Structure formats: structure tokens, C-alpha cells
Design a protein around this ligand. Sequence first.
Ligand SMILES: C[C@]12CCC(=O)C[C@@H]1CC[C@@H]1[C@@H]2CC[C@]2(C)[C@@H](O)CC[C@@H]12
Ligand SMILES: C[C@]12CCC(=O)C[C@@H]1CC[C@@H]1[C@@H]2CC[C@]2(C)[C@@H](O)CC[C@@H]12
Ligand SMILES: [Ca+2]
Ligand SMILES: [Ca+2]
Lengths: 177, 177
Amino acid sequence: DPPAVHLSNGPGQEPIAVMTFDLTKITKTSSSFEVRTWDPEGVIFYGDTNPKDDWFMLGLRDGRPEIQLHNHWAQLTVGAGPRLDDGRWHQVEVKMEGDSVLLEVDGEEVLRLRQVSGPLTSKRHPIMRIALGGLLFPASNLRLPLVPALDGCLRRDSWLDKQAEISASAPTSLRSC
Amino acid sequence: DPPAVHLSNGPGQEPIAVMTFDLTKITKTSSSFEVRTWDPEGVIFYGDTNPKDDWFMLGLRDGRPEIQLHNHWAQLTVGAGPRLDDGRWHQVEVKMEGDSVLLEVDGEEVLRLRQVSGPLTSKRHPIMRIALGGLLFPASNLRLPLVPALDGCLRRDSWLDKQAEISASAPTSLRSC
Ligand SMILES: C[C@]12CCC(=O)C[C@@H]1CC[C@@H]1[C@@H]2CC[C@]2(C)[C@@H](O)CC[C@@H]12
Ligand SMILES: C[C@]12CCC(=O)C[C@@H]1CC[C@@H]1[C@@H]2CC[C@]2(C)[C@@H](O)CC[C@@H]12
Ligand SMILES: [Ca+2]
Ligand SMILES: [Ca+2]
């Protein structure tokens, strides 16, 4: 089996990994991974350039994907797709394509948020953070609060553009599944 | 004894802790801690609002404090103070006072970088990061490269302003001394 990691560490709700990227170097604006869980609710990943007004979250709520986003063009809270809380590995892809954010699950397009973003490259503060398994702000600050901990597993993950990655958090924390 | 933590985890040079702060809420612009080491060289802490052009590092080089800083007003590489690599606990305080950054060691003022910063509050991108025990950029990007790992210990630490802290990294990583 390909190497999987725990999405939560237990008591605390701090992300298990944080990656930071130089925005002027991003050419690939998609992430993809595999996820397995029995948990109906929690954070799979969070991205931001600013935690007060340029941020994105993908989690589960009622076993289904949920996207929360606030940036200059769009502010939204959307559920879409099938229940992923069945203990089977699922393929997920999040892509930004033109002004749209796409969500793919198991090879199918399940959500397309159109006209939600201008070009990254020409963005207002050129550093983007990616956190896995939680937020980089307290849960009460979401548009719609959820309890962040997602007792699940992750593998085959690839975030945005490797060539633009400025830092990656200590991998001393990671816990194998 | 008050509880101490390892500044490095060993193989990797990733910071052992990352704290992020809302700049419009900072009222206390100082940090202070205690440090004990036999290591002549490495990073004690790094701060930034942007890792490409608004960043600060405090480490040791030849057993002495070294500050590296690049922001809009100042770009500099300065050694000052006594050797701290003697295996005794040392008190250190880093303070910003008006346009000056002060460095105190064991209750004495050893360095004052004057006219190196305008007001934080009215700053160009309101999120500051603090990393302990390494940088949030590769070492080759410093003004003057050093091997970041500092095999040392830290206690009684307090960073900037607690009331402005947006996130603190998972404390699952921390290793007691
Ligand atoms: C979903 C995207 C784009 C595609 C993907 O790989 C994940 C990443 C997560 C951060 C998002 C980004 C789209 C643009 C956003 C929503 C910015 O406005 C703020 C955070 C960004
Ligand atoms: C030293 C200070 C200010 C005082 C202290 O508590 C640590 C903190 C580390 C980040 C520094 C900051 C002074 C202002 C700087 C140098 C900004 O320009 C960029 C990073 C900042
Ligand atoms: Ca949960
Ligand atoms: Ca060293």
C-alpha cells in the first residue's frame, strides 16, 4: 500500500501540516489526494493568502464535501457530491481553471464554483498557505462553524505547485495509518 | 525546573513551532525567552510578514547573537553581545521601541538597531509569522547563510502579543529537554 497519514492528532485541532508557496511561481493551480474516513464532519484542507479575507476550506459535513470560501469576489458555503464517510478510499481533485474552482470526486465533476477568483499570479499578497487537517484560524471564524477534527487518512497527495513551495512544515508530526 | 523544549528535531531544519498574529491587534511588540546551548551556530527564531521582503532572524554565529533583517527600511547582518554557547541558561529579550529594535541579553542592552522599522499597526500586509528554531525559507536565502539547526533548549518564552495570536502550531512536535 502507498503511504497514508492521519488527518488529526486527537485532542487539538491544529493542522497536521502547513505548506507555503510563492504565488508568482505557481503554474499548477490544483491539488489532488485520496481520503478515507468514517467521520461525517471535519476539515480536509484549508488554503489562504490572508486568514481574515482571502481563504478557502474543503471539509465534510453530513459525510459530504463542503467548501467555504471568502475572498474579494465571492463569499460562500456550499455542500456538493456524495457521502465520503463510508471507509473507502476516495479520489478528490480541487482545481482552479480560469475564474472557476472545480471539485472532482472519484473521477466525476460534482461542483464548479464559477467566477469566484481572478488570476492568482496577479494577486494581492503573493504568499499562499495550505494547511492539511485543520484551519489556520479558530473554527468560530468560519462562515458556518464545524468541529474541525477529521479522524481520517490521506495518501497520494500533491498540493498546488511543488516548484513554487517556499516551506513545508516539520514532518516529525505526521502519523502513519 | 520550568518546562524546557528542544530547538531542533535533528535531521530536518524545519521550525519546531510557528505562530501567526493579527498585526492590527498587536500592542506588545517584544518577545522574551531563555536559551541554553553548546552549539555555536543556528537559528533561535525567525519572524516575517513576507518571506521575500519583510523578515527577521535571530540566531547564533560563533557562539554570539546575530540578527539578519530585510524589510522596506533596512537590510542588515549584525553580530553583537557575548558568546551564549556555554551551556548556561541565558535571558534574551527582543523589543521594538519606536523605529528601533533592541536586543537584551541577561538583563543588559547589547544591541540597538535604530530606524529599521515604521509602525507595525500601519503595516503592509497585516499577518506576522513567528517561527522557533528555524526559518520559513531555505537557508541559502539569508543575507548571510548559516546552517539553521540549533541543538539547544528553550523555556519561559513569550512571543509578541498573546491577544493578537491567530494560530499556534501543533504542540505534538515539541520535545522536552
Ligand atoms: C482552491 C485553491 C485553488 C486550487 C487548489 O489547488 C487549492 C487552492 C486552495 C486555496 C484557494 C485556491 C483558489 C483561490 C483562493 C480561494 C484564494 O482567494 C484564497 C485561497 C485560495
Ligand atoms: C523583531 C520583531 C519585533 C519585536 C519582537 O518581538 C520580534 C519581532 C520579529 C519580527 C520582526 C519584528 C520587527 C519588525 C520586522 C523586522 C518586520 O519588518 C518584518 C519582521 C519583523
Ligand atoms: Ca469529525
Ligand atoms: Ca548548529
